Amino acid sequence: KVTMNDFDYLKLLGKGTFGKVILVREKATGRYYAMKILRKEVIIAKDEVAHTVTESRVLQNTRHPFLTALKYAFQTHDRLCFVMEYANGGELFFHLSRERVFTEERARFYGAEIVSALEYLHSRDVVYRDIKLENLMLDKDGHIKITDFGLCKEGISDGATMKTFCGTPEYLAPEVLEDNDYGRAVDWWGLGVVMYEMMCGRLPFYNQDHERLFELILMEEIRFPRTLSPEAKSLLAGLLKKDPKQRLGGGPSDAKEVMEHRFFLSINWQDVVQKKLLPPFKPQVTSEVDTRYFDDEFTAQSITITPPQRTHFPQFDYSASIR
Amino acid sequence: GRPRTTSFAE
Ligand SMILES: NC[C@@H](NC(=O)c1ccc(-c2ccnc3[nH]ccc23)s1)c1ccccc1
Numbered sequence: 001k002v003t004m005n006d007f008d009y010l011k012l013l014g015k016g017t018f019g020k021v022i023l024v025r026e027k028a029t030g031r032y033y034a035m036k037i038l039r040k041e042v043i044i045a046k047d048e049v050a051h052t053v054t055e056s057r058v059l060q061n062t063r064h065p066f067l068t069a070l071k072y073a074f075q076t077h078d079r080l081c082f083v084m085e086y087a088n089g090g091e092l093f094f095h096l097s098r099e100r101v102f103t104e105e106r107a108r109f110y111g112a113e114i115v116s117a118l119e120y121l122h123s124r125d126v127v128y129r130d131i132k133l134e135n136l137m138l139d140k141d142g143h144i145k146i147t148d149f150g151l152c153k154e155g156i157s158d159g160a161t162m163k164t165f166c167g168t169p170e171y172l173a174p175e176v177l178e179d180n181d182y183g184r185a186v187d188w189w190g191l192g193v194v195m196y197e198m199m200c201g202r203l204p205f206y207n208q209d210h211e212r213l214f215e216l217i218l219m220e221e222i223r224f225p226r227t228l229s230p231e232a233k234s235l236l237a238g239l240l241k242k243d244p245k246q247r248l249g250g251g252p253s254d255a256k257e258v259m260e261h262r263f264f265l266s267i268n269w270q271d272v273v274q275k276k277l278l279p280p281f282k283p284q285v286t287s288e289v290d291t292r293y294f295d296d297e298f299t300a301q302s303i304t305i306t307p308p309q310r311t312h313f314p315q316f317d318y319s320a321s322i323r
Numbered sequence: 324g325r326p327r328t329t330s331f332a333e
Binding site: 016017048051093096097100130132134148150151164165166167168169170171202203206 | 324325327328329330331332333
């Protein structure tokens, strides 16, 4: 069994209510990884055990260039640990906040790699349901890596629906803000919101009051900068169609509709999956312990441990080499 | 630059 003391704990990359993510070094190999450490006490209290099991199961059963890879899933008496390959390039949220806006060419690169990832998950009957800038990381080469599969739903084939009110408030599709069920097209709405942010430098709808936010998502008409290209306006308008039936990617062919849109005219999609598209930005990391593309808010904090049977989480533990 | 968002469920 793998344990806490098999790793050195170097720098805090993320922190929140569920737990934290730390850059670690595996003592045996000397190799670096990102370890998401979640408190079982919190997961049980919030009644989110099913989501933690789903995340591990999706990570175990997925392999794609633009999805994060699980090395070890292990647990202690009160903690759940995901050991994952370290994306040194940081979040897309970090980079877009720094640069304010991307060019249409750079957004097209990131958009294509996300579409490739979403086609993969959808062909595997998985709906991701949490596309956003914080969940999109960059690897050392500058390629996209989707992280955090906690809100995934499995077994969702052509036209199957979901009931859980979940996601992130700012990225919720209009149909999720209505009663009853919704389809896998919510992922293409999410793609639309991130694409909108990359090219327009803001969320298409924002208010800190969720009441006002959800009214904007349901009722408000999106706007575009005058100088945005016609194909970019058409793509965003297609992805952000409030009716999922009339949304780009909402038809039976799914990602095909999005891939065949005139905005991606210049893209060969077999080259996308083959990592043959040239990244417009290459992370300037000097070492492996270099965390320049993460917030000082987190990386400046001193690493510490928390002072607090069959408290086991079944169907969680895993090794990439054993399976 | 918007504030960090948080995921949620039910
Ligand atoms: N809900 C937000 C969530 N933040 C994350 O998921 C991550 C932060 C930093 C990550 C990372 C960095 C480098 N390489 C990476 N490879 C795989 C991940 C990753 S992932 C979170 C979860 C739990 C507690 C707090 C925050």
